[PDB]
Paper text:
In this system, thousands of copies of transmembrane (TM) chemoreceptors, the histidine autokinase CheA and adaptor protein CheW, form highly ordered structures known as chemosensory arrays, which cooperatively integrate the sensory inputs of multiple receptors to regulate the autophosphorylation activity of CheA. Core signaling units (CSU) of the chemosensory array contain six receptor dimers, organized as two trimers of dimers (TODs), a single CheA dimer and two CheW adaptor proteins. MCP molecules contain a periplasmic ligand-binding domain (LBD), TM four-helix bundle, and cytoplasmic kinase control domain. CheA functions as a homodimer in the CSU; each protomer comprises five domains (P1–P5) joined by flexible linkers.
Author numbering:
A (entry chain D), F (entry chain C): 1 to 131
B (entry chain B), D (entry chain A): 257 to 647
C (entry chain F), E (entry chain E): 15 to 157
């Protein structure tokens, strides 16, 4: 025997909510005109954990949205992309949509397709224009 | 390193069930506590003593279950920077959000309905309220704004304020829009009172709500959600200064504090929050009034005297104020008196909705039951406030 | 199919109601009158921590002669969404009327509207009136 | 899909406060049920009936508060299989631990204390409860062993059994080791009775504490740890089949049903779990007995009469048993009478430790207050089972 | 300031205890005898839902002449580990003994032991025997 | 601005108790005679969250100890690593070491250096046998 699959789903929905909350507070103390190296790694390792469960249980809406952010933060901490007030505003606008899409799975509903196709472009296009 | 602890996952449904169990417990002990007081103290000698210790422990466990169900306000304040730091750069402004009292907590069910109301207020401040950096320096005001989202506890309530240092809510613009829809206004209302008139149907900080604000939510819809939760709302703004919007939220809506008044056999109850003072007016403070009525002189001000026996048509009541008792009430800022026969005292009765088997009647808001078994009718203070206006 | 009903007297006549709608019979006692309410309603009486409004059928039905002797009995109902009681001069009997005993009632009631009568109970020299208590306690006056 | 819900983190420290608040709540609430009993059911019928509602709500709330601290037993079942799969390879065996009843729950405070007790049982089943693979094939059994670990609820208790498939514990070794310690044993005892011999102090499955069966942990220590948690322990062994070890853990440890008796102005209480029935003594059934006591013929059995007035030296009580009443008791597969003066009924009250303001004697287990305010003394049934033998 | 103590009478002799350890004073009340206990312990009585044993200090000291009256008084205490009362025939007068008035216990034989006595309270022509009720009720004999 | 980060440290310890527990449940039901690719995915989810989650809060010892084990779980679920009664026992024994390292942070202390130097050599040794 084993625990019902619902526990793994509700657990990820609750854990993910806590990660988005703690991860969102990192950008608050992290000023856009002076990003600390130690703080950038905290945001990267935070969103990376959400990508694991998002891609295991079949959360394509959250896995894709989280995978793009993992690439931007990776190139920004190792020294491959600049950071300014414009990019910091995108993360805040991104984490907010991730919370809305995450709530859809809580109520057993499909996330808004318009929000997904709109946020993914803002993350992918930034990886090419910032270079 | 002070001290650490741990936590375990608990379903919200299980925590909600506790409120139902303790709810009836607090309501059950309240009814039994009243019976022990009316009856003789012989058999209830030690019962009343133990009730005091249980009356306090009953609420301690209740507040404990609620506190465990609440969450820090920082979790709610962590979503405002997303709309402030982002919209400020898009529109071309500089606004710095400040958080005060982050240790405050709030019920989870209340957090799932107060984010959007508050989110709408912040959105209006970053469009109509706060101006551009150039316009602020022209009037001697600092370039960078200063949005403050305060929050703190209040005994059995929670206070949340949204202070702003923007352009401020215009006064002449609210009077012209409120009078058009048919709302009683006047020039005597100060800048703080006119600010409370933006709750008209389909209206908010600006006339263009549906056009500017995307979501169909405004001051009229915000106040609607507050009524469902049992809270209040207050605004203290002024032109050329700032803007502040206070929002209250209760914690327990099952007991109402009010004195039990008697009017010939029949017994009634009056809320305690509305009762100001009480005395026995004599011939040295009673004057007539147009329409066969009277007025009570309280420190020069002649307040209207409303007879409680006329509303309910109670036979054999004390028509004369010198024989009965007159209590000073208040509802909506204005005060008004109320005539009764004899008082009893302060008693915390349990609210009982009458709409479960009939419907609301004019002059009554709720009811309850005394220790013996008779039903006590809770008079509505809002209805009596409108009777004196017609006199 | 056959249906049971609770017979009760109200003056010089006897009406009836469905037994399923009745909850329990109790004694008639003083009630707490509520002003600004219809005249056919007396007051309220708490029962098991629930406000149960009491109604007097002897005063309604366009009847002037009313009595309050010791035979006065109050019947507690249970209409799912409402639990309003009714007072009667005294429970008479109980009948298990069948399809042949329950005859359609006229369109013009004797003292009610045109939709507050379920039928007429026959019993030799006793003609019972099956009143539709379901809709009787939900008219414009009860809302 | 399967099921959707919501959950939030709850600090364990706050959960401990709930048990402390609800604990004293039931105590203070119990006092209300004591004085209220003095009222008559005719006049105060609604009050008495309403008083019970406040008591049952507190009990249901207490049981619900504990559930908040519980967790799924599946997490606890993750430590035994790892030890079996790891210990079986070292000893040279192939055992498969099967899990039954994963929906069961247990209080977190008990989970931290139920590991070593149960862990000691798993090591015993693999050390001698299951023979080598070669021996299993000779007896027709499969080479790969098997181990069951069931766990389901049984009313207000948590039942957990550990059953195996091997031959089980040795039979001749328990009797051989028990006779050396001076314990009353014999070969006529069945496999079920022989299993109740390892509970003696300093007596394990083997002649000495073996390292394979935990370091410094034995069957004697497992029992003492369960008594502190208000639980019990039972074994249902069988040579050739297996060995089942059951453990009980009540949910709440406060209220305890018991028969209230009186012995000359001294109202005592007797646990209801031991009470069987009662009857009127007869002179033809009473006979002498060693130690001044007497016996009572109860259906082909002369149960020993434990005069409660001689042990405690109660003056003024009815010395003649013919005028008094006897209450039959049972505990440990054997009965024992108990002479009393009068009876009352089934009263549910809260227990109290007399050591808080004095001390506890072998003849007392817990105190409690009655309806008339007088203090009562719950008589321990474990003592009466042995007092009849000492006298 | 000097140490305060509560003085009380027990027939002929007089003793005293610390006032801080005393909670309140109230007349005699019914008690409940305990199964197999010494003779100097009357019983237990309910007090605000707490079991407060009652001990007779006059019987504990093992006196020759013992009397009983309806004016008995029971002084309620509040020790650091238990809440046991004491029976007294009648309170005397609260005093504030100083460092010079608190003398050591006698050298000859007395009722209690040296550990169960704090000293001697001098007050004119009335020698008071200070008793350490704290450790007395919490001794090995009472546990 | 942001609540005290100390509150989130206790939250991660609570999640680890469930992840480490759930991580073992799948390792136990996973019979070494007939592994299941579906069960290996759940095992990687528990180890993937602790790896990216531990490092988010600055936990370096617990991160390195989980990264080495996670690398073996990724190659196992994808069919690039063999499993037997001996390899499965190593994963169960590893969970015990990870529990000890977690208890160190729960008491505001660092794990034992001797225990870390032993589990690492054990995981790296299996990588040479599998590869």
């Amino acid at each position: 025997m084993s625990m019902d699959i619902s526990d793994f789903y509700q657990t990820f929905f609750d854990e993910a909510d806590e990660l988005l909350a703690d991860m969102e507070q990192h950008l608050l103390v992290l000023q856009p005109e002076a990003p600390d190296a130690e703080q950038l790694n905290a945001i990267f390792r935070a969103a990376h954990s959400i990508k694991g469960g998002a891609g295991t249980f079949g959360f394509s809406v959250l896995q894709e949205t989280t995978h793009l952010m993992e690439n931007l933060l990776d190139e920004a901490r190792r020294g491959e992309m600049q950071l300014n007030t414009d990019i910091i505003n995108l993360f805040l606008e991104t984490k907010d949509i991730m919370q809305e899409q995450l709530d859809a799975y809580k109520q057993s509903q499909e996330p808004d397709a318009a929000s997904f196709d709109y946020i993914c472009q803002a993350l992918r296009q930034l990886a090419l224009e910032a270079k | 390193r002070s001290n650490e602890s741990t936590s375990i996952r608990v379903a919200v449904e299980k925590v909600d069930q506790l409120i139902n169990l303790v709810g009836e417990l607090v309501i059950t002990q309240s009814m039994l506590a009243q019976r022990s007081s009316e009856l003789d103290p012989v058999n209830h000698g030690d019962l009343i003593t133990s009730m005091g210790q249980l009356q306090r422990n009953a609420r301690d466990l209740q507040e404990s279950v609620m506190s465990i169900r609440m969450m820090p306000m920082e979790y709610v304040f962590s979503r405002y920077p997303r709309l402030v730091r982002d919209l400020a750069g898009k529109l071309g402004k500089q606004v710095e959000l400040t958080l005060v009292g982050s240790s405050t907590e709030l019920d989870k069910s209340l957090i799932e309905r107060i984010i959007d109301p508050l989110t709408h207020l912040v959105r209006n401040s970053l469009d109509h309220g706060i101006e551009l950096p150039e316009k602020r320096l022209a009037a001697g005001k600092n370039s960078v704004g200063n949005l403050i989202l305060s929050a703190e506890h209040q005994g059995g309530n929670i206070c949340i304020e949204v202070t702003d240092d923007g352009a401020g809510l215009n006064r002449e613009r609210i009077l012209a829009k409120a009078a058009s829809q048919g709302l009683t206004v006047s020039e005597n209302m100060s800048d703080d009172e006119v600010a409370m008139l933006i709750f008209a149907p389909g209206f908010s900080t600006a006339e263009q709500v549906t056009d500017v604000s995307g979501r169909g939510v405004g001051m009229d819809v915000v106040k609607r959600n507050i009524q469902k939760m049992g809270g209040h709302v207050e605004i203290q703004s002024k032109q050329g200064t700032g803007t502040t919007i206070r929002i209250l939220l209760p914690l327990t809506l099952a007991i109402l504090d009010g004195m039990s008044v008697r009017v010939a056999d029949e017994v009634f109850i009056l809320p305690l929050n509305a009762v100001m003072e009480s005395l026995q007016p004599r011939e040295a403070d009673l004057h007539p009034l147009a329409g066969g009525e009277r007025v009570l002189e309280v420190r020069g001000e002649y307040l209207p005297i409303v007879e409680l026996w006329k509303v309910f048509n109670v036979a054999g009541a004390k028509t004369e104020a010198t024989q009965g008792i007159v209590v000073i009430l208040q509802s909506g800022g204005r005060r008004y008196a109320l005539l009764v026969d004899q008082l009893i005292g302060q008693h915390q009765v349990v609210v009982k909705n009458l709409e479960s088997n009939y419907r609301k009647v004019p002059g009554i808001s709720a009811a309850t039951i005394l220790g013996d078994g008779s039903v006590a009718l809770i008079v509505d203070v809002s209805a009596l406030q409108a009777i004196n206006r017609e006199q | 199919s056959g249906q049971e009903f609770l017979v009760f007297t109200l003056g010089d006549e006897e009406y009836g109601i469905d037994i399923l709608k009745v909850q329990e019979i109790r004694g008639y006692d003083q009630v707490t009158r509520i002003a600004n309410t219809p005249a056919f309603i007396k007051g309220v009486t708490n029962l098991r921590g629930v406000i149960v409004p009491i109604v007097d059928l002897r005063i309604k039905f366009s009847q002037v002669d009313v009595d309050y002797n010791d035979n006065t009995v109050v019947i507690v109902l249970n209409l799912g969404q409402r639990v309003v009681g009714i007072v009667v001069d005294g429970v008479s009997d109980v009948l298990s009327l069948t399809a042949e005993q329950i005859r359609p009632a006229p369109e013009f009631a004797v003292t009610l509207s045109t939709e507050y009568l379920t039928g007429l109970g026959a019993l030799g020299d006793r003609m019972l009136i099956l009143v539709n208590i379901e809709k009787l306690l939900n008219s414009e006056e009860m809302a």
